[PDB]
């Protein structure tokens, strides 16, 4: 009466097969999920790179402009300082001369 035993072995193996199928399906689902995740993080990388890129370019433009303003303004400042010095020396000379005439 080993026929029944063989029948049962068949049953066990069939059950195991079905279970393995379910498991494989789950693993494939996990692969798909990981793939979708890769796609998403890829999209984020693209947008991050793009945004940071344009922003940085803009900032570089404004920075260099502000540098130009600093140079020009400081040059004007130095020249104004020279005019001031000359005028002060004129005051000083005239005042001395006045003191001389008064005496």
């Amino acid at each position: 009466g080993s026929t029944t035993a063989l029948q049962e072995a068949l049953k066990e193996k069939q059950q195991h097969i079905e279970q393995l199928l379910a498991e494989r399906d789950l693993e494939r689902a996990e692969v798909a999920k990981a793939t979708s995740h890769v796609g998403e993080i890829e999209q984020e990388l693209a947008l991050a790179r793009d945004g940071h890129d344009q922003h940085v370019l803009e900032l570089e433009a404004k920075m260099d402009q502000l540098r130009t303003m600093v140079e020009a303004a400081d040059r004007e400042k130095v020249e104004l300082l020279n005019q001031l010095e000359e005028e002060k020396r004129k005051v000083e000379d005239l005042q001395f001369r006045v003191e001389e005439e008064s005496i």
């Binding site: 130095v78 020279n82 010095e85 000083e92 000379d93 001395f96 003191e99 005496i103």
Partner: protein
């Protein structure tokens, strides 16, 4: 090695103006931050050489650098006082206003650093013979140095100092006359009435002017 590259950059007389500006700015920067103990003299020489540059801004920047070295390490100018003074005063005759200004700053810092006695002794014949505005700057610097001397030393140097101030007082240029007046005031601040017998040969009017400016300095 960092300094050496800058120094090598500076060896290019009358050329590579922007690069030498960079080297000078970096050198000043280092001056703001013990190297000198071994490398001072060469730099100084280049600086003096740089006073003869064709580029005015290079000269002005050089004078600012010199000003920084004077302000940081005066003692090292001990054996080069006469020379440095000569060069700065010479630099005061430059046609560029910014250069004259920076030269006045460098001369100003120089006046508080250099040994006073040697400074005065060197400056006297310059006062006596130099052209405007070298004599002028020499007198002004003489004043700033006089502010730093004791009564006795000034007293010992007076017979040499006085003729230049009197003759300068008789100079046709108003600035020289005024500077001479101020120098006389600065001497008076130290030795008081003792100055009077040295001024016996002056006319009453200039005596009046002097007394007025003295009184102005007193209050």
């Amino acid at each position: 090695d960092l300094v050496a590259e800058l120094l090598k950059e500076l060896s290019n007389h009358n050329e590579r103006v922007e690069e030498r500006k960079i080297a000078l700015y970096e050198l000043m920067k280092l001056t703001q931050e013990s190297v000198w103990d071994e490398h001072f003299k060469t730099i100084l020489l280049l600086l003096l050489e740089t006073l003869g540059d064709k580029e005015p801004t290079i000269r002005a920047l050089a004078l600012k650098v010199l000003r920084e070295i004077l302000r940081h390490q005066p003692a090292r100018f001990k054996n080069y006082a006469e020379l440095t003074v000569m060069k700065t005063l010479e630099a005061h005759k430059d046609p560029h206003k910014e250069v004259v200004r920076s030269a006045e700053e460098a001369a100003s810092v120089l006046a508080t650093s250099i040994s006073p006695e040697q400074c005065i002794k060197v400056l006297c014949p310059i006062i006596q013979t130099a052209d405007y505005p070298i004599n002028l700057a020499a007198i002004k610097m003489q004043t700033k140095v006089i502010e730093r001397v004791s009564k006795e030393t000034l007293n010992l140097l007076l017979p040499e100092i006085m003729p230049g101030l009197i003759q300068g007082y008789d100079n046709s240029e108003s600035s020289v006359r005024k500077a001479c007046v101020f120098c006389l005031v600065a001497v008076h601040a130290v030795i008081g009435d003792e100055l009077k017998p040295h001024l016996s040969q002056l006319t009453g009017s200039k005596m009046k002017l002097l007394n007025l400016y003295i009184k102005r300095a007193q209050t």
